[PDB]
Amino acid sequence: LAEAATDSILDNPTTYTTSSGAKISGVMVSTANVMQIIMSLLSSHITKETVSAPATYGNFVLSPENAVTAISYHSILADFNSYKAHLTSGQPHLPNDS
Amino acid sequence: MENWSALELLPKVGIPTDFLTHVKTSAGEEMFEALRIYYGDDPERYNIH
């Protein structure tokens, strides 16, 4: 039942890992009765472990590419040589929420 | 320890390896890291854009 599932396009290798290096492959959920039966029957393979999990939710991140589209639109729309945000000194910096 | 590395074939194709450091220093390590994340180069640290 666990083997038949296809894997996902996204999977962070550092999240949901046990105290050892083992990677968690998935989760089985069922009512209380089924879990009682399984934990009684297959007690040898069951084990209680500590698992590292994401402490907080994920963030909205704005794609760096869409700055290029905005700059192209401004190139069309801005006055002759009036636009200047695309050139600057020092390290280049894209507006970001990091 | 790999059979061979991607950097080794860069001179064969016609791009010197030192040029990669030129691009990295031009990007400034802030925008470079943002773009490297965006392109999916770091699985340990990825978010949906």
Side-chain angles (χ1 to χ4, degrees):
Chain A
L1 196 71
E3 169 63 21
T6 302
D7 51 357
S8 54
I9 306 163
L10 211 172
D11 65 321
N12 191 331
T14 197
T15 65
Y16 287 106
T17 55
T18 191
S19 61
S20 307
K23 308 277 189 62
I24 297 299
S25 302
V27 63
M28 285 195 172
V29 314
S30 201
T31 70
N33 300 85
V34 169
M35 291 285 127
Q36 305 291 269
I37 287 165
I38 288 163
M39 285 188 286
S40 305
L41 190 50
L42 301 181
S43 187
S44 180
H45 300 81
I46 310 308
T47 177
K48 179 88 79 190
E49 296 200 46
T50 179
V51 175
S52 60
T56 190
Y57 288 78
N59 300 104
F60 160 73
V61 295
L62 188 81
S63 172
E65 280 199 67
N66 62 17
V68 190
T69 298
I71 288 170
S72 82
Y73 271 85
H74 286 220
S75 78
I76 290 165
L77 298 167
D79 297 356
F80 180 68
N81 292 343
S82 65
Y83 197 67
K84 299 182 195 296
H86 64 293
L87 61 83
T88 190
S89 62
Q91 311 293 356
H93 170 276
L94 292 179
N96 68 83
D97 304 289
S98 71
Chain B
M1 221 291 276
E2 61 283 341
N3 171 19
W4 58 268
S5 70
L7 300 186
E8 298 169 61
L9 250 64
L10 288 177
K12 309 300 178 70
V13 171
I15 295 157
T17 57
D18 56 5
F19 195 75
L20 305 187
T21 51
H22 188 197
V23 171
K24 281 173 55 70
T25 48
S26 184
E29 185 186 326
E30 164 79 354
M31 191 179 74
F32 186 81
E33 278 298 293
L35 288 166
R36 197 170 74 83
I37 288 166
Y38 169 60
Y39 294 131
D41 190 55
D42 191 13
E44 293 189 350
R45 199 158 44 134
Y46 203 73
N47 293 294
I48 287 171
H49 290 252

